[PDB]
Amino acid sequence: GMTYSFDVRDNTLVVRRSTATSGIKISYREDRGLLQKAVYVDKKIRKFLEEEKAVAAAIERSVEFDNFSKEAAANIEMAGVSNMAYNLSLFIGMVFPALTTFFSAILSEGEMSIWQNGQAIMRILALADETKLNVVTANGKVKQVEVNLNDLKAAFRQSRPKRSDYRKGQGSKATESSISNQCMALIMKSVLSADQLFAPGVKMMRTNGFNASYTTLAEGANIPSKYLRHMRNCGGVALDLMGMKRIKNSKSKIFSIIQKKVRGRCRTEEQRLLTSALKISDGENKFQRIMDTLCTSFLIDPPRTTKCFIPPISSLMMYIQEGNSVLAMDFMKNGEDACKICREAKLKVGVNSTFTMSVARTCVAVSMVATAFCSADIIENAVPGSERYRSNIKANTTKPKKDSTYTIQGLRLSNVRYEARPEDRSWQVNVTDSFGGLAVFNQGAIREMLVRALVKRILKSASERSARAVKTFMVGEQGKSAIVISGVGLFSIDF
Amino acid sequence: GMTYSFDVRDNTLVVRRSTATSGIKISYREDRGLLQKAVYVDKKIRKFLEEEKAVAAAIERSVEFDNFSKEAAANIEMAGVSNMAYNLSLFIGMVFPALTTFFSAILSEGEMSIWQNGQAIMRILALADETKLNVVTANGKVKQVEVNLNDLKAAFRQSRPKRSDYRKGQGSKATESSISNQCMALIMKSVLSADQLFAPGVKMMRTNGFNASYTTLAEGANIPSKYLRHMRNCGGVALDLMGMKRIKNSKSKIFSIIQKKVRGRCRTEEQRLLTSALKISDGENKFQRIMDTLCTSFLIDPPRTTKCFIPPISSLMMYIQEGNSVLAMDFMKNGEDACKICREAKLKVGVNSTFTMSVARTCVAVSMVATAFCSADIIENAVPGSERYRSNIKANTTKPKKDSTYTIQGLRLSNVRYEARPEDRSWQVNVTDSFGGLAVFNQGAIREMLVRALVKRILKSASERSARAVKTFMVGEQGKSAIVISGVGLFSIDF
């Protein structure tokens, strides 16, 4: 050793040692003992930097990441009218009042109408179902209240629908716990999707050796495994694939189990064959070639995805507290009932310089469609006025930090909208900028105007499909309106 | 003959004759004498339908088209700090006050602050420079005032800057008339670009045998030829190409003149060669192949385009009437000074069920960037709240119809923005819809993840370029903000 410092080799922060003599040699000591002489800050260094001696933000995101990754790493190992709608409405109609009642001991009325607090209630609920403190937004100010998780758990287990209350198909093995878990998976998918706005999972994909572009395949990666086990398709295909790659290196039987699950999630035949084409007895290359091809295909043709469309938690609690009934509602088919609750209740939110109103509106939008990876155009039409670029967002999290301060104002959600479930003859194939100097154009259209067999087909099919602009309808109570899904999303500007 | 009716064969309305006998034979009589027994309604049929006996809309658009096409057909035949900035500001600073004064005889003060009326003033001015009635918006209601065009012409010719007033390069042949015409071309490009929102020119391209997709190459086609002659590049390359095709069929010398102009408008070498490759001595095919290739290339790499960035006409008149000076302003380099005037003046507009506020905002946006073919993202950021889809627009024209009624309210233009003149490392290459069922994706990226030589190169270059998302900055006084040009524009939903 001779000289010590802190640096960022890749996207992590490491200890850099320079020794001079036969000139200068550079070492990155992974000892992390040393730390005195000196995005991801890591545990030992964050404990030493917090104990003794931008720095606070990249560490809040870092420990957050640690939690996300632990939850994801639970889920990757575990890889080895409609009933569901009626059950989910029954579940909500029975559980939410019990949540209203429990938290009336702890929170005021106005407090439960604050967006952050609904989120907080579900997170603590999920925690109990698996005495802690709980960070609550007050009069712009953050208070820490105490929640007894046994009371919360017991209240939940008794309040929730019974096995006989649910509609189950004939000879169903489904139990009370089982269905509860399905509902919690559907609801946790919505609540947690706002976090993936702030930390999509890029780091995790990179750390597992997947191209960052495959992050869009990691929706809901942090849904608590007890719930996802029952509702695998709430989870996003990247979980299974990473499980398959990890077990490819390292037993044989598991690989077949995950493979079968992935095959079932495929919605085109091309992906099904491609999936089966992966074999535990292949070289590193050409298994990676197949895996990569498969991943890429999944960007073209998404895996089978399950989810629900519910209004904000607080809104939902208010709407039920006001006397309204959700038993006859359908949150599976589309977002209509979710929008009806949205327009009706008078949700409130805490906002500030970093977590602005347009940020909050984006967080709502994202939970309504239960995915951070949704088209930005859709997001914008779903909750008007929301922010369409992640880059313009200055906050680093949805969660109040206890030193946090807000101004509590109204989160009006009339003019909210949902996408019609589907069941473009335009001539305009390019635009210019303001100067008429630069053009953006539809590649597929421009091209028309002018194992290996698999790849060729997929590539042709892709181009054949990208040539036509994709349109979709946003539905209000006043009617229905076409928009174009451009392909731009959140995260489209880095970073 | 046996039976007669009206029908729409292609996109025009024709007279359909059925004769039955040896069964039934169908004829489309082009006589148009006959009309009693019975989108483009045509003259003789519109005169007969108006004189004797949805119908009114498709005919307002039809006669409008006739005017557009006549003006375009003048321009296609005629195909055979900075000075310009300072001259344009001088021109405006001297001409606009004279317009304020002239129209004070005819209009009230409040009337001149109405958007429609500024448009009307320039159109009549252009007319005079080439006693009529003039349709004016009043108190929501439309009045017809009388304008004496000789007075208007004389006032203009005397008020406008003199040859010595302008900055001209050494040994310039430029005259007073000459420069006036350059300025009128720049200003008419802005004022008239709102019409191309309503009638882009699809019909004209189709009628000349060009693919409708090439409509984006027809910006400013209806700019009065006396002005465009001096400022060809305000006009859009389709004018020259159509001239070249028309003369290809039909003298030799003209073809070379237009060819030279087109060659000069090219900004890539590929287009220059391609342009020169067109020869009057080629077969129908393979001249069309080259022409088409050239047209397509122009969608990828726009021709040289000139234009100015000015605020709405009325705004401009008000700002000058209020005492402010534009002599030191630059409307060529970008839209900064235009936005400064926008924020300052208190423009008003007449609006109604069809011509709504969001429609009016779109009409303003389009004139600010002086093109109907600009990116929708840009339009939306340029004048917030404007309508991003032509399809959602119910009006058929910017012009009050004399039977028209409005509610006159304020057209606030703070928060307006301009695109920084340029001098994306994102991992997100696809989005999903709300259901996670359908994906939209970047073709170029997906492909990377997985005479004839010319064509091949162009096609490769296209794909190479479309792979990376294009970003640009919108500038406010509070700062600068990145957006992505998605490729979606106005007209992206048909029809």
Residue numbers in the entry:
A (entry chain A), B (entry chain A): 5 to 25, 27 to 38, 41 to 45, 61 to 75, 86 to 112, 133 to 182, 201 to 320, 325 to 497, ...
Q: What does the publication say?
A:
The genome of orthomyxoviruses consists of multiple segments of negative-sense, single-stranded RNA molecules, each packaged in the form of rod-shaped, double-helical ribonucleoprotein (RNP) complexes. Our study of a fish orthomyxovirus, the infectious salmon anemia virus (ISAV), shows that its nucleoprotein (NP), which forms the protein scaffold backbone of the viral RNP, has a bi-lobular structure like the influenza virus NP. Each RNP contains a viral RNA, a heterotrimeric viral polymerase (consisting of PA, PB1, and PB2) and multiple copies of the viral-encoded nucleoprotein (NP) that bind viral RNA in a stoichiometric manner. Our results indicate that each ISAV-NP binds ∼12-nt RNA, shorter than the 24–28 nts originally estimated for the influenza A virus based on population average.
